[PDB]
Design a protein around this nucleic acid. Sequence first.
RNA 1: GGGGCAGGCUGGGA
RNA 2: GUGCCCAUCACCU
RNA 3: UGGCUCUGCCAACGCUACGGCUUGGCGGGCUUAGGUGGUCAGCCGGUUCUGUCCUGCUUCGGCGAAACGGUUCGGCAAAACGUCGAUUACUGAAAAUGGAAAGGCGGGGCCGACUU
Lengths: 114, 112, 110, 111, 122, 328
Amino acid sequence: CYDQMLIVERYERVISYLYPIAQSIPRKHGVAREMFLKCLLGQVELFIVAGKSNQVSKLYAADAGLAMLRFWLRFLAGIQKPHAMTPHQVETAQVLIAEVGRILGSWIARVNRK
Amino acid sequence: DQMLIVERYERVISYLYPIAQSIPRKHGVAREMFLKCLLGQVELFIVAGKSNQVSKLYAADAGLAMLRFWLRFLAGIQKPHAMTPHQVETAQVLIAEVGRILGSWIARVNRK
Amino acid sequence: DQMLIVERYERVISYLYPIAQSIPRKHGVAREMFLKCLLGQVELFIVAGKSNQVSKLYAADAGLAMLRFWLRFLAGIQKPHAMTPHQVETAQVLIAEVGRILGSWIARVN
Amino acid sequence: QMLIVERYERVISYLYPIAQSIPRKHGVAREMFLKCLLGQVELFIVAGKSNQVSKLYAADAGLAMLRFWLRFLAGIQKPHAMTPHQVETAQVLIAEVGRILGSWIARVNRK
Amino acid sequence: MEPIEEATKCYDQMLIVERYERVISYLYPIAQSIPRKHGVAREMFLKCLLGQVELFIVAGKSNQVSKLYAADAGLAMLRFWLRFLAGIQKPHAMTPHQVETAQVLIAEVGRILGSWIARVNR
Amino acid sequence: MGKRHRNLIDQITTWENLLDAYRKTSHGKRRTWGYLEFKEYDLANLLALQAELKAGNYERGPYREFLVYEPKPRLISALEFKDRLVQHALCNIVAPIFEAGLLPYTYACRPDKGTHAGVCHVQAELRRTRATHFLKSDFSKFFPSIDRAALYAMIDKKIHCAATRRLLRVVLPDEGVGIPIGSLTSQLFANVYGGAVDRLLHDELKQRHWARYMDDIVVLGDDPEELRAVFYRLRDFASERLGLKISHWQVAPVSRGINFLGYRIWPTHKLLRKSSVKRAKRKVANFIKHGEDESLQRFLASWSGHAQWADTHNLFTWMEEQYGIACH
RNA sequence: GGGGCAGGCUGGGA
RNA sequence: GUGCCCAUCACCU
RNA sequence: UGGCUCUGCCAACGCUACGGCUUGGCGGGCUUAGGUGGUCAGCCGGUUCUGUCCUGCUUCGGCGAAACGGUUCGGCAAAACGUCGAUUACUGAAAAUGGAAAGGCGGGGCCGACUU
C-alpha cells in the first residue's frame, strides 16, 4: 500500500497541473474537456482499485488510464479550434505522468515478482 | 447494514453537498464530478445491499476512497480552495464512519 | 410482468417529472441525476422483463431504492427547496406501489 | 441480420428530428431519448458481433425502452408533445425493427 | 536516454491509436462543425470518436480478447455515426467526400484491429 | 558567413531544433515500434535527450545490424529512434554547413538536388559543350571505405565547436574505415567525403563538366585521353588520400550511354536502367499473381513519374501485352 | 563476321 | 535502415 | 458547442415550505506539416534470335567507331555565395566554443535576350 499511496500522491501532481489546464479548455472543446477531466480525475479510482486489490490487471488498467491521459495531452495539443494544452503544457505534463508511470512500473514488477 | 450504511452516508452528503454547492462556477465541472461521486455513491451502497455479492461492496469502498480524494482535491488542487481543512476532517470522520460499516460489511460477507 | 410495473412506474414519472423539473437550477446536478434516476428506472424494469436474470430484478430494486433516496435527499436539500415533504409522501406511495409489484415479481421468480 | 440496422436507421431518421426538437425544458428527457435512439445502433452492432441471444435481448429491451420514450414524450405536454400520429408512425418503424429482431432471436434460439 | 517506457507495450495498441488519432484528427473538426442544434448528437458522436481511443488503449493493456471486440463494436458504431452525420443529420454535417475520406481512415484502423484480433485469437 | 562555427551544440540542442529533428525523424516512420514507443512521452523524451546532448552525456545506441539484400547484399545497420533523432538534430545544424561548400555539381543528399537533377545536369552538360566522350567512375565499397579519419579532417575543418565535434564523434567515432551505411549522418559524411574528389576534379584538374552522385562520377569531355588522365589522377588521389578503390570505371564515348542514376543518358535521349525496368515488371507481375490491383494503380502512378522522364514505353506496352490492363 | 546501342528471353543473389 | 527527388492521399491558407 | 449553480424585467405548463422555484420569451453580463507509395546511392550473370548501327586510323601498341524539359541562349563574374588563404595573421599568458583580410580558384551568382 506504500506504492498505492505513493502513486496517488505522485498522480495528484499531474492533477494539480492538468486540472487547471482542463478547466481552461473552452466550452467549444467541451466534450473533449469533460472526457479529459473524467480521465484525469478518474485515474485516481484506477489507482485506488489497483491498491484495493492485488491483480496486476488492475495496475495495467491504471497504465491504460495513464496512456489515455497521454493521448488527451496529444489531442488537446492538436485541437486547433479555441486551442488548449500548449506544447509546453504537454511537455510538463508528460514529465509528471512519467513519474506516475515510473512508480506504477515498479509497482507492476513488485506484483509480478510476488 | 444496508440502510445503516446509507443513513450514515446521508450525513456525509448532508455535510459535503453544501460544500459542493458553494464551489464557484469556475469549478462547475469539478463540482458536477464531485456531486456525481458524492450523490452517486449512495447507488453503490444500495446496489450492494440488494445483491449482497462482495463485488459491489468493494466498488462502494473504491467510491468512498474516490470521495476521500475529492476532499483532497477540493482543498488542495482546486486553486480557489472550495473546502477548508476543518471540513476535510469532519467529512473524513463522516466518511470514516460509513467506512467502518463498509469494513464490517465486507468482513461479514467474506466470513464464508 | 414488466408491463404492469412500467405502467405503475409511469405514474411515478407522471408525478415526479414535473416536480423533478421544478428543482432549482442551483440544485442542477442533483436534479439531472434525479431525472436520470426517475426516467432510466424504466429501462431497469424493461431490461428485467425483456430478459430474466433475477439480478436485473434486483438492479430494478436498487434503482427504486435510489429513487427513494432522491426523494429524501431533495426533501430539505438546502435553502433552495427542491421537493416539498408532501410531494415525497405522495411519490413514496407511488414508488411503494411499484415496489410491491417488484417484490411480488421477485418472489414469483424465486 | 444487418438489415436491422439499416431498418433502424429509418427509425432514427424519423425519431431524430423529433428528438432534436425536444426543447431545453425537457432537456434530460431529450438527452436520454437521443442516447436511447442513437445508442440502440450499438445494441444491434454488439448483437451482430456475437450472435449471443443475450445481446439480442438487450437490443429488444432497448427497442422496448424506445417504445417507452414514445409513450413518455407523448405525455410531456405543451407544443412539444410527440404528436399521436408520430407515436403511431414511429411504432410502425420500431415494429419493423421488432419483427426483424424477433426473427433474429428465434433464429438463434432455434439454432 | 531510453525513451520513457510505459508498462505493457503493445505495438498493435500503439499503432491502432496512432492510426485512429488520424480518424480523430479528421472527424473531430467536422464533429465540432455540427451546429448548435444537433449538439446532443455531436456530444454522442464525440464520445464515440474520442472515446474509442480508450477502447483501444484498454484493449492493449489487457490479456482479454473481450476488450478487442468492444473496440471493434465502437469502430462499427463510429461507422454508423458517419452514416448518421451524413444521412440523418439535417444541414449536412459530413459531406460525402468527408464520409468517403473518413471511411478510408476508419478502414485503416479496422485493418489493424482485425489483425490485432486475429493475432490474439491464435 | 565566414568560417569558424564555434558554438553549434547550442543550436543542435535548441528545443525548436530538436522538435524539427523529432518531426524529421518521425516523418514516414509513424508506423514503427521506435516512434510509437517514443511518441508516448514524446516531448518528455526530447527533454531527456536535449539534456543528454546539452550535457555531453549522449551515447549513440548500438546499431542493430541486419543485411538487406535487395539490389545486392548491403549490411544495413539501423538505429534507435532516439539515435536517428540525434542524427537529425546534428544534420540540421551540421549538414547545411557542409552541404554549402559542396560544389554545385554534387547532386546527392542535398536539398533541391537529387537523383533527377543529376541525370538532367549530365544530359544538359552533354548537349552544351557537345561532349564527345565521358568518364564514369564508381567507388568500390564507398561507405565501407570512407577512412573515418581523413573524414574527420573535413568534419573538423568546419565544425570548430569542441562539443559538436564530440557529438559527431559519438555518432561516428573517428577510428578506422567504415561509415555505417544506413544512417543520416553517414549519407552526409559520404557526400562530404566524395566532395574531396569533386574539388580535385573542379579545383585541381580543372574539370568543369562533371557530376557526382555520392560515389558515381561522370566527367564529360572532348578527348578520351584527357578524360583517362583525369581518372588516373582522380583514382590516384582517392586511393592515396581517401582510401577509395575504384570498382568500375569507363572512359566511353558519348554513344555508349552514361549509366547514371537509373538512367542511361545520351545527349539526345535518356532511357532507364534495365534492372529498374525488370524489378518493376516482376514487382507488378508478383502483385498481380498475389492479389493486389488497386495498390498497383498507386505504384503505377508513382513509377509513371520515375518513367515520365525516361523514354520508356518499353514496359507499359509489355505490361499491357501480359495482362491487358490499361497502363497509360 | 566481328563489334556498339536497343529490345526480348531466361538463371541465380533473392 | 538512410537521405534526396518524385507520385498520390488528406488538409486549410 | 442547443451554455451559465446569472442576473434585471415580464409573463404562465406548472410546482410551491407562500419566500419563491421552474419554464418561456425579453434585455444585460459571463461564456503548413501529414499519410501512403516509389525512386536512387544500390546486382551478378547466361544466351542467341530480332531490331538497328559501326566496322577506320595505325605508331602496330592500342585509340577506336555505334523534339524538347527553362536540361534556353548569350554577356558578365564587381558584389554576395562557395572554396582555399585559415580554426592562419592579429588580439591576448593562452584562442581560450574571439577573430579577419589581401588575394587565388570557382560558378553556385549576376545581368539582360527569349521562353518558362
